[PDB]
Amino acid sequence: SMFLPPPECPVFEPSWEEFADPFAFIHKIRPIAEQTGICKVRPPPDWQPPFACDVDKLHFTPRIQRLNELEAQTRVKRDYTLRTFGEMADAFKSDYFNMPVHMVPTELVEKEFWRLVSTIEEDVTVEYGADIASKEFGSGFPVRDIKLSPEEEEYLDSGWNLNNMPVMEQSVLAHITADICGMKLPWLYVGMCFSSFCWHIEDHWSYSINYLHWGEPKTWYGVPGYAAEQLENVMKKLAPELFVSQPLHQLVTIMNPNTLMTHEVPVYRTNQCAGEFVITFPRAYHSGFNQGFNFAEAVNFCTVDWLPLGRQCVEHYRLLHRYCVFSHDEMICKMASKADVLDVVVASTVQKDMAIMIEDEKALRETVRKLGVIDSERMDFELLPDDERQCVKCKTTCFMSAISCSCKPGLLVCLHHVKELCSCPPYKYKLRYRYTLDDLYPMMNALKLRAE
Ligand SMILES: Cc1cc(C(=O)Nc2ccncc2)on1
Ligand SMILES: [Cl-]
Ligand SMILES: [Mn+2]
Ligand SMILES: [Zn+2]
């Protein structure tokens, strides 16, 4: 009736030992958590990062949000101090329910959220903050500059400090030189009651990890990675407008979990409270809303486990003609080029992915040869701005190889879309390649050595 809450997602309480290494721990829980898409992690009670801030000096620009189910919204791109926002947000929740904010049951806000997003009689609109850390509004975790407490430095380089999550050596996005700005850096989220984030998966099917610093809880819904296409099909029918192609302007939407459960999509939920961690697994759809005033920090990340998924995702993007954030192949080769200083298990996994990359590339080069492309020249793709090296057809970011033509100066196609560049005859085409097969096999061999 009304709303049936989805079954709760797995909750984990690592001891200090298992908690010590984030990447170790995530790998342990992975067979469990990947069945539910999201999971929750409560740090040992000991572990308590000092969030220190002046609520008056931290300003940010509010984004505005209408609350209608199945209505398209864009993924994020006056002015509030954290205090004035806190005051607006508590006033709002308190007025909406005629109650003190911490006396509204979470059950109720959930019920009420889904009621007001379906009723287009109501048009409730809320505000929120979303931004990567900057000079006016910084990470809620300890960084490096002012002088820190003796305890603030304890957490200064914890693995669960989310600033450290990109740059760790068991992470893969780590050694990406390319400034994948929005991806490798933490986002900051200032919530109020009903402010929400629509159904989505992460760029390149990466993990994410989300930390609630303080404030009222955040409610999550999650779908395991294996049911992603099932969910997408359900959303194609009930809301086909979200799927019309787009030059960052992906459309995402709010949709009732019960609607998905009804169509046999497994959904899980949790309330994330202050000091708890939520982890989303690869290709795991999620959405949720805030119970009231709160502050969260989140970051994208990639493990060795993810590398094959990372390849599969880029293949998938190509079919969808969806833009890439970074070149998977460029990442692999950068790792191969630093094979000597690589973590050994990392090296073994890069090696297996390199092996696939190379044999696919061999085949693709044979194919474009038999299409009459004869001329060729090495090309340093990594020097090109990403928008200067997308396949004109499927929009994938080129790095291993591309086809150019003197007839269409500056355009490129991947080797899958040779026939889609221009109407000149094959001998006017040119294979632009980063590496010869002879350059590549030694790069892989260095990985095999480092892994033994
Ligand atoms: C509004 C609002 C959103 C959040 C938040 O946490 N959003 C999020 C976005 C993408 N993936 C996961 C979560 O907080 N306030
Ligand atoms: Cl509405
Ligand atoms: Mn997300
Ligand atoms: Zn292409």
From Swiss-Prot:
Binding, 2-oxoglutarate: 128, 208, 210, 218
Domain JmjN: 9-50
Leader sequence segment: none
Compartment(s): Nucleus
GO BP field: branching involved in mammary gland duct morphogenesis; cellular response to fibroblast growth factor stimulus; cellular response to leukemia inhibitory factor; chromatin remodeling; lens fiber cell differentiation; mammary duct terminal end bud growth; negative regulation of DNA-templated transcription; positive regulation of gene expression
Domain named JmjC: residues: 154-318
Residues involved in Fe cation binding: 200, 202, 286
Annotated GO MF terms: DNA binding; histone binding; histone demethylase activity; histone H3K4 demethylase activity; histone H3K4me/H3K4me2/H3K4me3 demethylase activity; nucleic acid binding; sequence-specific double-stranded DNA binding; transcription corepressor activity
Keywords: Acetylation, Biological rhythms, Chromatin regulator, Dioxygenase, Disease variant, Intellectual disability, Iron, Isopeptide bond, Metal-binding, Nucleus, Oxidoreductase, Phosphoprotein, Repeat, Repressor, Transcription, Transcription regulation, Ubl conjugation, Zinc, Zinc-finger
Tissue expression profile of the protein: Ubiquitously expressed, with highest levels in testis. Down-regulated in melanoma and glioblastoma. Up-regulated in breast cancer (at protein level).
Zinc finger (C5HC2): 391-443
A GO CC term assigned to this protein in UniProt: cytosol
Function per UniProt: Histone demethylase that demethylates 'Lys-4' of histone H3, thereby playing a central role in histone code. Does not demethylate histone H3 'Lys-9' or H3 'Lys-27'. Demethylates trimethylated, dimethylated and monomethylated H3 'Lys-4'. Acts as a transcriptional corepressor for FOXG1B and PAX9. Favors the proliferation of breast cancer cells by repressing tumor suppressor genes such as BRCA1 and HOXA5. In contrast, may act as a tumor suppressor for melanoma. Represses the CLOCK-BMAL1 heterodimer-mediated transcriptional activation of the core clock component PER2.
Family under the similarity heading: Belongs to the JARID1 histone demethylase family.
Disease cited in the entry: Intellectual developmental disorder, autosomal recessive 65: A disorder characterized by significantly below average general intellectual functioning associated with impairments in adaptive behavior and manifested during the developmental period. MRT65 patients have moderate to severe intellectual disability, developmental delay, and facial dysmorphism. Camptodactyly is present in some patients.
Domain remarks: Both the JmjC domain and the JmjN domain are required for enzymatic activity. However ARID and PHD-type 1 domain are not required for activity per se but contributed to recognition of the H3(1-21)K4me2 substrate peptide. The 2 first PHD-type zinc finger domains are required for transcription repression activity.
Record text on subunit structure and interactions: Interacts with FOXG1B, PAX9, MYC, MYCN and RB1. Interacts with HDAC1, HDAC4, HDAC5 and HDAC7. Interacts (via PHD-type 1 zinc finger) with histone H3 unmodified at 'Lys-4'; the interaction is inhibited when histone H3 is methylated at 'Arg-2' or 'Lys-4'.
Annotated protein name in UniProt: Lysine-specific demethylase 5B
Residues of the full protein shown: 26 to 753 of 1544
